[PDB]
Design a protein around this ligand. Structure first.
Ligand code: HEM
Ligand code: HEM
Ligand code: HEM
Ligand code: HEM
Lengths: 140, 143, 140, 143
């Protein structure tokens, strides 16, 4: 259950993320693929090399989904329902992979926005990403 | 922990640029803030309510210095992590009753702190090598 | 995120649990203490022996809390808020202990209600207990 | 896995009264139903949509028989779990890419199935002994 304070923190953090969301998401996906190669098994049709256009497009998609989730933080199961069906019913992704991707997103945010990455913002983003991972994993 | 020679060279060069006294305490404080149930083990450190009180605690800073020194000792003995972290594993299991998952959490927080400091210099391959290092350290502590 | 199907499943399962809730909760606590002795560190003032009146009373308390959570399944964050503050702000309980207690509750329910413990009811109860564990662990 | 002589005697007596062909299959089916992401590994089995279709799958029943055979081998050699489960650990880690948490999940589901079948006979001490047995088996597989 997200606190009201952490909600404002994640809203401000992703607002300052702004227009670099696609590049940040592509870099987070690249970090996840490099440091957790078992996550690559969910993309057997992809080209998972460095600078891949497919990875860049998927990072853009993930970033837009995260932006929508931020904009609809109080009604996430409704806003993210098509993604929940995709990841839970069809893809059937292990939640450990969601944890790994959330960590890689946090690492990318830390590396790109040092000033914005205060401990409170870090905790808020961690809780927000955990909430997002819960909705996509759950089948309802 | 098995690393390629290039990965080992990159890990050591970033580690030399590490300010131990600051980043160990930073990692410990961020762990205590992000995962607040970990404050149960450190309630003897004093005021740990607000994030700024956690990050401004000399006891937290000193304990972070010791945890980073153990991480450096483990890094110097990557081929003997289990024998290096035997006494610490005994202390954390039999005496402190800390969960194995909490050790993985602290490793991830340390990786986040390293990324926050190095920024662009931290690179996905360097991060992958450091992830393998901290995973090995956590496994050695969890034994 | 729970669905109407597993909501009705957990409601029926706990309704058929009925008046044995106190003894079921006491037995679940005893199982947790016996199989996961690290959980005993949260009760240093208790007598954690077999047949203990303190354990029986705490099991009754946990069972009544589960009953009211079932009755207010759609509004858990607010119904369980006093317990959330107790477990998260004051006691600072690791969520792994919540997972262990949920497992022991499932084992007790399996051992005492064999007919009711169908795979669908088992999955519903697992998800309901996970949701309850998230609200108590979360600080908001 | 280290067990007391009484715990070992209790574990073996309950294991003798176990119907392998049934309980292995229903443990696997309950795993697939409760944790639906595990059906990714068993898509080749066939119809796994509804709980009744999962629990009525001959492929699921046969694989549960194999899994319980592996579990029975661990009970026979509790002092050599790591060497007993080396080949299975290699297969599950390198060929199947199964997360080590799923091993603990399957062990817990097996404990729940044993409780379901034995009722009063599956007393809290027996459950504790079986809990550390399945924890050791999961740790051996995760190596
Ligand atoms: C916060 C976490 C995540 C978000 C916001 C997210 C978002 C998305 C989005 C927006 C799509 C595109 C759907 C479409 O175009 O119809 C997608 C597809 C996909 N996702 Fe995720 N995802 C997340 C986590 C994960 C993880 C951890 C994995 C695997 C380890 C994963 C595996 C996939 C796959 C395989 C696809 C299919 C893409 C394709 O076939 O081109 N997702 N996800
Ligand atoms: C990779 C992970 C970790 C490493 C390398 C590590 C390292 C250390 C070191 C070097 C000490 C000092 C021992 C001594 O002075 O004799 C220590 C003590 C301690 N550790 Fe950790 N630790 C880790 C994880 C954790 C975590 C996650 C927690 C709690 C959630 C924890 C709780 C404690 C406590 C309470 C002490 C004793 C503090 C005191 O005596 O003042 N440790 N650890
Ligand atoms: C999973 C569902 C749980 C429920 C429904 C629950 C419910 C409760 C209730 C109703 C109380 C009594 C509060 C009061 O009387 O003011 C309580 C207290 C307490 N709970 Fe829990 N609890 C759960 C999990 C846990 C776990 C897993 C632990 C520790 C491993 C734990 C540790 C405690 C402690 C130490 C107390 C204080 C009791 C005392 O001091 O007498 N709880 N809980
Ligand atoms: C935790 C204890 C486990 C034991 C004792 C065990 C045992 C076994 C055994 C003996 C086999 C050989 C089957 C054969 O030779 O035909 C096998 C294969 C397999 N295991 Fe496990 N397993 C465990 C956990 C898991 C889990 C949790 C999963 C998935 C979530 C899994 C996925 C598989 C798959 C996909 C196969 C291959 C099936 C096939 O080839 O048809 N295993 N396992």
């Amino acid at each position: 259950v997200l606190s009201p304070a952490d909600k404002t923190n994640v809203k401000a953090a992703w607002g300052k993320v702004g227009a670099h969301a696609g590049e940040y998401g592509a870099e987070a996906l690249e970090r996840m693929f490099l440091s957790f190669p078992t996550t690559k098994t969910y993309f057997p049709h992809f080209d998972l090399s460095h600078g891949s256009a497919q990875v860049k497009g998927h990072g853009k998609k993930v970033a837009d989904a995260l932006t929508n989730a931020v904009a609809h933080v109080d009604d996430m199961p409704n806003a993210l329902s098509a993604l929940s069906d995709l990841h839970a019913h069809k893809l059937r992704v292990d939640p450990v992979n969601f944890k790994l991707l959330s960590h890689c997103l946090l690492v990318t945010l830390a590396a790109h926005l040092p000033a914005e990455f205060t401990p409170a913002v870090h905790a808020s983003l961690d809780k927000f990403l955990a909430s997002v991972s819960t909705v996509l994993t759950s089948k309802y | 922990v098995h690393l390629t020679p290039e990965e080992k060279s990159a890990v050591t060069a970033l580690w030399g640029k590490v300010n131990v006294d600051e980043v160990g305490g930073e990692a410990l404080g961020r762990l205590l803030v992000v995962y607040p149930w970990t404050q149960r083990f450190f309630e003897s450190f004093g005021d740990l309510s607000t994030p700024d009180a956690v990050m401004g605690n000399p006891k937290v800073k000193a304990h972070g210095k010791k945890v980073l020194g153990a991480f450096s000792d483990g890094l110097a003995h990557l081929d003997n992590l289990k024998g290096t972290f035997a006494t610490l594993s005994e202390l954390h299991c039999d005496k402190l009753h800390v969960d194995p998952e909490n050790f993985r959490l602290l490793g991830n927080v340390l990786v986040c702190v390293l990324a926050h400091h190095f920024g662009k210099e931290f690179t996905p391959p360097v991060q992958a090598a450091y992830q393998k290092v901290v995973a090995g350290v956590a496994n050695a502590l969890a034994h």
